[PDB]
Amino acid sequence: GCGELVWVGEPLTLRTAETITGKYGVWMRDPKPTYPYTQETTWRIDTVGTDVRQVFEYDLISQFMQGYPSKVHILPRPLESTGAVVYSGSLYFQGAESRTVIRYELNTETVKAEKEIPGAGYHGQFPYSWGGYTDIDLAVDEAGLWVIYSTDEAKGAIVLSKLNPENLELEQTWETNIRKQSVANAFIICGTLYTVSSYTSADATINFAYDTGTGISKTLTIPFKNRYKYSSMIDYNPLEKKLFAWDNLNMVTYDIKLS
Ligand SMILES: [Ca+2]
Ligand code: NA
């Protein structure tokens, strides 16, 4: 059931980090789960610091919300920022101090592919407005895997490319007119990129949309609340049809409605 985003619900807090290491981070579920994982499996990465390698895995939602991890993976290379996603059994993440996206197969703890995003800025060139080295933001929607970034040629405007999930090849690329550093985060629903106006305000909005099918850009005014005043990560999960976010220690989710 695809459509245009028309409404975002109130943020629901699912878990609160207990240490400064989790002030910002990324938490994820797989919209295309593969054995031995399920739709309940959750991954959490606390991303403060300079050698981020621990990925907490939870077999069950109950464990994610109330307990300890069922497994901890130690990544073979440190990770950059909050942009990572899980898709069809692999964690896709950006190597620290690089423009390299890495496909890490979770069940075998193996790197399956690595790819430089051509021309992509990295390490504070085209972050979202809060900074945090958020130059490169992976995304999953109803059609698969994407990457959101910018380049010098695009003068910092958001660029998005569809990615082959097996080998990380770029399949198609679109250039918007939205300055990436002017928005708080972004995500893709049904092939339309949406941006968030502010990472601090209780009265933020979903403020722009770019439809990859038509090339048309629009301005929106859909209310979006940053309950804890510091959202570092905002992504869409196309299986649950919800936003997943990280806001000032808190792993939160938002219902949405499409029309
Ligand atoms: Ca995002
Ligand atoms: Na992301």
Numbering used by the authors: 244 to 502
Can you list sentences taken from the study reporting this PDB entry?
Inherited missense mutations in the myocilin (MYOC) gene, within its olfactomedin (OLF) domain, constitute the strongest genetic link to primary open-angle glaucoma via a toxic gain of function, and thus MYOC is an attractive precision-medicine target. Myocilin has no known function, and there is no glaucoma phenotype in Myoc knockout mice or in individuals with a homozygous N-terminal truncation mutation or hemizygous deletion of MYOC, but rare non-synonymous coding mutations lead to toxic intracellular sequestration of misfolded myocilin. However, not all mutations in MYOC cause glaucoma, and common variants are expected to be neutral polymorphisms. Among the common features associated with pathogenic myocilin misfolding, we demonstrate that a single metric, OLF thermal stability, can robustly segregate benign from early-onset disease variants.
V449I, a conservative substitution found in a hydrophobic region of the OLF β-propeller, appears only in gnomAD. Assessment of spent media from cells expressing each of the 16 full-length myocilin variants revealed WT-like secretion for T256M, R296H, L303I, S313F, V329M, S331L, T353I, A445V, V449I and K500R. Structural integrity was further confirmed by high-resolution crystal structures, which were solved for 11 OLF variants. No gross changes from WT OLF were detected for the structures of T293K, R296H, L303I, V329M, S331L, E352K, T353I, K398R, A445V, V449I or K500R, indicating that these mutations are accommodated within the native five-bladed β-propeller fold and do not perturb the dinuclear calcium-containing site.
